[PDB]
């Protein structure tokens, strides 16, 4: 059912957990470094879990896609072929930026954080800087132990703060990926849909130095030895059975002003989707010519497709449940309620009014803000602006450097400049730069940026053509030039005749100014958010409704049962799909081109000891009424005894609008059954070594 519960709400959910079928004690689930919860890891935007005493980590194929794509060429395509390491020495690096975060400690720091905020009094910008400074000091102290990375999280609009401390494993290697026609069966056509037949799984292995402490990749590193790992279930999962997920959902917007919704529905989602589709169309074309561009842009393409379809789905789901309406009506009913109680409910009503006006302000510049951000996110301009900004920050004491540009951020900065090599083709980026300049000029005169106007020299196809011709002369295209500038000082940047670096030096004053304009808006928000959101919460409780914070990349638990859903009268989707369903979709053409070995194993009913009698086949994917969102991919699904029964990977089509308005009847998780993982590793793309390592072969 509904809810992305913090581990500190376990007393609240203990009884519901039992009634749904948990046979572990609430005590045991509360131990976030115990069995099974201490096996669950964050990847940074995906979840994963340990599944052996030797550092084997299982997650989704689409979570590993980055790493597979980084190790792929046109002439050895791991995306297409799969990857299997018969020995641990065979495992390839997942990339310098790849991480496994293992939870160490959570501490409430709420009292301190709102002190530091308040201690700045009544200046918006000062309030932001004070929280920044408080956070930086906390983290610096927590990370004083070598091998840990820490994070500060704000919950429920700033009514609670907690500090998380993680062991940061920095040497992650790929151990196994099934072929792309298994890992991503049905491609973007089946994405966000049920029935689903997708084998969305892949394995990493986590490594540290011989001292047992985190290190960056080296051939002298050895497998991490986790305290806790998950075991595969020994009881077959069926319809109605208890399941739970723990993992790291990224963001939801269930506490929001109605106007935040209208802006998103009417403007944000349609605009981003259109841009994303236009870039897809350009890259698609050029990659059909050019396998190098096709392989190099595949991860980018996957992201664009996935977010744009998600937003198409949210727009449709708003109309289906009249989200605009529901928002309006709970807002009216909450404003009603507040004046309602006069004296006590005036602080909250004030808040509503500030928040509301803050939103109109970001509204005034939203097209500028988006366009400029995405223009600067193309490869060479992104590289130049980041690298120049770093040279500026490096001049300050580390404690005053912008988050993202402190010493602790250098590994990821350097790592990103190297990874870019496998994701950049200059003919392709030129077309994206073009696309975004064409969209910049389109902007109205009041919505423009002075410094970009000047840099460009006029509002036409001619100037665009000149810009593009000039930028083409950058040397930032090679990893080696990027890494030179990573190390260069600010004067060296301002001296450069590189045209990409000239662009950055040109616009940075504006970007720092706009960043201040953002930090100031955030500061006013930091006053008004928590009071109003605390009132939304209080109302919800007065209505008997479930109360939990919007997602924020921190660890959450969701639970429920295996069950399908009914999209229309006269029909129902069943909780499982089956092997036969995979082969029924076969067309021999991407994305419905399963391996021959699958096709033959199924035609022969070779179920490998994995059939579930109740469905007369091996289960492939299943639905359940858990409450997950982006960031939950790869999260392990556990059964009533805490055994692994699948991996979360997607949502059904009608679920996605639940980011704003939760609909219990149509919100389902889509998970890959652990028996399908097993079946693939036995009969299709075999990995007898990993199975034996997991005590299932």
Which residues does the annotation place in the binding site for substrate? 191-192, 306, 631-633, 649-650
Run of H or E including 349: helix 346-364
Residue 332: partners with Cβ closer than 8 Å, 6 or more residues away = none
Looking at 15, 23, 189, 319, which residue binds Zn ion (CB under 5 A)? 23
DSSP string, 296-346: HTHHHHHHHHHHHHHHHHHHHHHHHHTHHHHHHHHHHHHHHHHHTTGGGGH
Residue with tokens 């050029």: 286
In whole angstroms, what is the distance from residue 410 CA to residue 404 CA?
Answer: 8
In whole angstroms, what is the distance from residue 172 CA to residue 203 CA?
Answer: 10
DSSP string, 389-428: HHHHHTTS-GGGS-TTSSGGGHHHHHHHHHHGGGG--HHH
**Positive or negative: CA dihedral 465, 467, 468, 469:** positive
Specify the residue, 121 or 570, whose C-beta has the smaller distance to a copy of itself.
570
What is the closest distance, in whole angstroms, from the C-beta atom of residue 15 to Zn ion in the complex? 19
In whole angstroms, what is the distance from residue 388 CA to residue 486 CA?
Answer: 8
Phi, psi at 663, each rounded to 5°: -115, 105
Q: Which of 219, 192, 537 is nearest to 348 (CA)?
A: 537
Looking at 221, 578, 629, 659, which residue binds a copy of itself (CB under 8 A)? 578
Tell me: does residue 274 bind Zn ion (CB under 5 A). Answer: no
Binding segment (CB under 8 A) for a copy of itself, from list 192-200, 232-240, 480-488, 596-604: 192-200
Annotated binding site: 191-192, 306, 631-633, 649-650
**Positive or negative: CA dihedral 118, 124, 126, 129:** positive
CB closest to Zn ion, residue no: 23
In whole angstroms, what is the distance from residue 254 CA to residue 667 CA?
Answer: 14
Binding mask 600-629 for a copy of itself (x = CB under 8 A): ---------------------x--------
Looking at 124, 574, 593, 608, which residue binds a copy of itself (CB under 8 A)? 574
**Segments in 420-553 forming alpha helices (H):** 426-441, 450-456, 461-471, 479-487, 490-495, 499-542
Specify the residue, 190 or 429, whose C-beta has the smaller distance to a copy of itself.
190
What is the closest distance, in whole angstroms, from the C-beta atom of residue 578 to a copy of itself in the complex? 5
What is the closest distance, in whole angstroms, from the C-beta atom of residue 640 to Zn ion in the complex? 6
Residue 569 contact among a copy of itself, Zn ion, none, beta carbon within 5 to 8 Å by kind = a copy of itself
Binding segment (CB under 8 A) for a copy of itself, from list 41-49, 177-185, 527-535, 578-586: 578-586
Told to judge if 218 belongs to the known catalytic residues of this protein, a careful annotator would answer no
Catalytic residue of the set 171, 200, 639, 673: 200
Catalytic residue of the set 383, 391, 633, 657: 633
Residue 23 contact among a copy of itself, Zn ion, none, beta carbon within 5 to 8 Å by kind = Zn ion
Binding segment (CB under 5 A) for Zn ion, from list 15-23, 139-147, 328-336, 491-499: 15-23
Tell me: does residue 487 bind Zn ion (CB under 5 A). Answer: no
Tell me: does residue 664 bind a copy of itself (CB under 8 A). Answer: no
Looking at 66, 95, 158, 195, which residue binds a copy of itself (CB under 8 A)? 195
Tell me: does residue 198 bind a copy of itself (CB under 8 A). Answer: no
CA 374 to chain centre: 18
Catalytic residue of the set 49, 52, 61, 62: 62
Q: What angle do CA 339, 340, 341 make, to 5 degrees?
A: 85
Tell me: does residue 50 bind a copy of itself (CB under 8 A). Answer: no
Residue with tokens 């990995």: 687
Looking at 580, 586, 612, 663, which residue binds a copy of itself (CB under 8 A)? 580
Tell me: does residue 581 bind a copy of itself (CB under 8 A). Answer: yes
Looking at 11, 571, 589, 604, which residue binds a copy of itself (CB under 8 A)? 571
DSSP letter for 447, please.
G
Told to judge if 352 belongs to the known catalytic residues of this protein, a careful annotator would answer no
**Biggest distance spanned by C-alpha atoms of the chain:** 74
Task: Give the residues lining the site for a copy of itself (CB under 8 A).
Answer: 194-197, 566, 568-574, 576-578, 580-581, 584, 621
Active-site annotation, residues: 62, 200, 633
Question: Residue numbers of the site for Zn ion (CB under 5 A)?
Answer: 23
């Amino acid at each position: 059912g509904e809810g992305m519960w913090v581990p500190q709400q376990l007393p609240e959910i203990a009884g519901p957990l039992k009634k749904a079928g948990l046979k572990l004690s609430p005590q045991q689930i509360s131990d976030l470094t115990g069995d099974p919860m201490g096996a669950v890891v964050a990847l940074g935007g995906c979840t994963a879990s340990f599944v052996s005493p030797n550092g084997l980590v299982v997650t989704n194929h689409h979570c590993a896609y980055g790493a597979i794509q980084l190790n792929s060429t046109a002439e050895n395509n791991l995306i297409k072929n799969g990857f299997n390491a018969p020995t641990t020495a065979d495992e390839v690096s997942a990339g310098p930026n790849a991480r496994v975060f293992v939870l160490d400690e959570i501490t409430d720091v709420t009292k301190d954080a709102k002190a530091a905020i308040a201690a700045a009094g009544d200046d918006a910008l000062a309030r932001t800087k004070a929280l920044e400074a408080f956070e930086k000091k906390l983290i610096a102290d927590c990370e004083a132990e070598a091998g840990f990375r820490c994070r500060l999280y704000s919950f429920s609009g700033g009514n609670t703060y907690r500090l998380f401390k993680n062991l940061e494993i920095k040497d992650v290697r790929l151990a196994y990926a099934p072929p792309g026609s298994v890992g991503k069966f049905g491609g973007d056509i089946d994405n966000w849909m049920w029935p689903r037949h997708t084998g969305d799984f892949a394995f990493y292995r986590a490594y540290v130095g011989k001292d047992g402490k985190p290190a960056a990749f080296s051939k002298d590193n050895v497998p991490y030895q986790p305290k806790h790992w998950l075991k595969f279930a020994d009881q077959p999962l069926g319809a109605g059975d208890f399941v739970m997920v723990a993992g790291y959902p990224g963001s939801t917007n269930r506490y929001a002003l109605a106007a935040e919704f209208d802006n998103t529905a009417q403007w944000t989602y349609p605009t981003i989707a259109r841009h994303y589709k236009n870039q897809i169309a350009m890259v698609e074309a050029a990659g059909k010519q050019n396998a190098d561009i096709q392989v190099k842009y595949a991860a980018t393409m996957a992201g664009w497709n996935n977010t744009s379809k998600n937003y198409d789905g949210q727009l449709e789901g708003f109309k289906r449940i009249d989200a605009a309406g529901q928002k309006l009506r709970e807002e009216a009913a909450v404003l009603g309620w507040l004046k309602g109680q006069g004296a006590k409910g005036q602080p909250a009503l004030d808040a509503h009014a500030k928040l509301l006006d803050l939103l109109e302000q970001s509204k005034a510049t939203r097209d500028r803000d988006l366009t400029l951000a995405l223009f600067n996110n193309t490869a060479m301009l992104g590289s130049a602006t980041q690298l120049y900004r770093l040279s500026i920050e490096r001049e300050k004491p580390n404690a005053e450097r912008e988050s993202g540009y402190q010493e602790r951020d250098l590994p990821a900065i350097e790592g990103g400049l190297k990874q870019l090599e496998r994701r950049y083709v200059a003919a392709m980026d030129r077309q994206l730069q073009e696309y975004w300049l064409n969209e910049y000029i389109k902007l109205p005169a009041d919505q423009r940026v002075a410094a970009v106007d000047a840099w460009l020299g006029g509002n036409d196809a001619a100037a665009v053509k000149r810009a593009l011709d000039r930028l083409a002369g950058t040397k930032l295209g090679s990893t080696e030039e990027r890494l030179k500038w990573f190390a260069a000082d600010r004067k060296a940047f301002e001296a450069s005749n590189d045209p990409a670096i000239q662009y950055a030096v040109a616009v940075m004053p504006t970007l720092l100014k706009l960043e201040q304009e953002r930090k100031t808006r955030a500061g006013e928000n930091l006053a008004a958010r928590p009071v109003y959101l605390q009132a939304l919460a209080d109302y919800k409780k007065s209505q008997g409704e479930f109360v939990y914070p919007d997602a924020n990349l921190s660890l959450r638990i969701t639970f429920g049962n295996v069950m399908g859903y009914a999209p229309k009268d006269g029909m129902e989707y069943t909780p499982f799909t089956t092997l036969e369903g995979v082969v029924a979709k076969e067309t021999g053409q991407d994305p419905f081109d399963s391996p021959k070995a699958l096709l033959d194993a199924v035609a022969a009913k070779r179920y490998g000891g994995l059939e579930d009698k109740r469905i007369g086949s091996v289960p492939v994917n299943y639905l359940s009424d858990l409450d997950i969102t982006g960031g939950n991919s790869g999260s392990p699904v556990l059964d009533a005894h805490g055994k692994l029964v699948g991996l979360a990977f997607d949502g059904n089509w009608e679920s996605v609008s639940s980011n704003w308005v939760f609909d219990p009847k149509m919100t389902r998780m889509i998970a890959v059954d652990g028996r399908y993982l097993r079946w693939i590793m036995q009969e299709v793309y075999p990995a007898p070594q990993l199975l034996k390592e997991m005590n299932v072969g």
